[PDB]
Structure formats: structure tokens, C-alpha cells
Design a protein around this ligand. Structure first.
Ligand SMILES: *[C@H](c1cccc(NC(=O)c2ccc(C)cc2)c1)[C@@H](C#N)C(=O)Nc1ccccc1C(=O)O
Length: 110
């Protein structure tokens, strides 16, 4: 099972052009027996996990990006490495989109 899970796709930079990934993916957080928190992104179509990163408490911060008019975009900033990942909610309703973001932040910071 997962502490938190929601439908969201990833994004990539095509040089100087921002381009969203049309592939459907599922973002979820799982806790291993070692008490570590793993942030993963899996393709719904293939069911394979392409992203697997180990995140420690307060290690990263998840926050909405005001720079995107959509308002459905959230970014994960890595304190160590300055790594940045962009995700966009795929749920039809935006009412619960904010709730999912908050839950993710709590697990990452707690
Ligand atoms: C926010 C974002 C903000 C402004 C513009 C865009 N995308 C496009 O302008 C665009 C135009 C045409 C085509 C074919 C695709 C895209 C996006 C979000 C979203 N959605 C985003 O993806 N931003 C993003 C992602 C990764 C890195 C940087 C940025 C960024 O906007 O700077």
C-alpha cells in the first residue's frame, strides 16, 4: 500500500521549450521496513516504476508553482543536489488536488 497516492504526469524540458509528458503516471509514497520514505513515479500504461528516489525527513519540499497558469503543477525541490522535478495533477477535480499536495508535503517533512 502507499501512504499517499494520486494520478499525475511528469514534465521535461526540450532544450528551451517546456513540454508536458502525455503519458499517464501514478505518483505515490511507500514506506519500507527500514523506515525510509521512497518517492516513486510509475507509468500506468506499462505498470513499471521508472522513478525511485529515497527521501529523508525535510530533505525535499513540495510546493505548487505559481509560474504556471494551470495551478495544477507542483514541484519537488531537493535540498541536497538542487534537483527539481515537476508534476501535474491528472484528477478531473481540483478540489482534492490541493489536499493531495498537502499530504505529500507532510510525509516528506514528517
Ligand atoms: C508550467 C508552464 C508555464 C508556462 C508555459 C508552459 N508550457 C508551455 O508554454 C507550453 C507551450 C507549448 C507546448 C507544446 C507545451 C508547453 C508550462 C508547467 C506546466 N504545465 C511546466 O511544465 N513548467 C515547467 C516545467 C519544467 C521546467 C520548467 C517549467 C517552466 O514553466 O519554466
Amino acid at each position: 500500500k502507499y501512504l499517499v497516492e494520486f494520478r499525475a504526469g511528469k514534465m521535461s524540458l526540450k532544450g528551451t521549450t517546456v513540454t508536458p509528458d502525455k503519458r499517464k503516471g501514478l505518483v505515490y509514497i511507500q514506506q519500507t521496513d527500514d523506515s525510509l520514505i521512497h518517492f516513486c513515479w510509475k507509468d500506468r500504461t506499462s505498470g513499471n516504476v521508472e522513478d525511485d528516489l529515497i527521501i529523508f525527513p525535510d530533505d525535499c519540499e513540495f510546493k505548487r508553482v505559481p509560474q504556471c497558469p494551470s495551478g495544477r503543477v507542483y514541484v519537488l525541490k531537493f535540498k541536497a543536489g538542487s534537483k527539481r522535478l515537476f508534476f501535474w495533477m491528472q484528477e478531473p477535480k481540483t478540489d482534492q488536488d490541493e489536499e493531495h499536495c498537502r499530504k505529500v508535503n507532510e510525509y516528506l517533512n514528517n
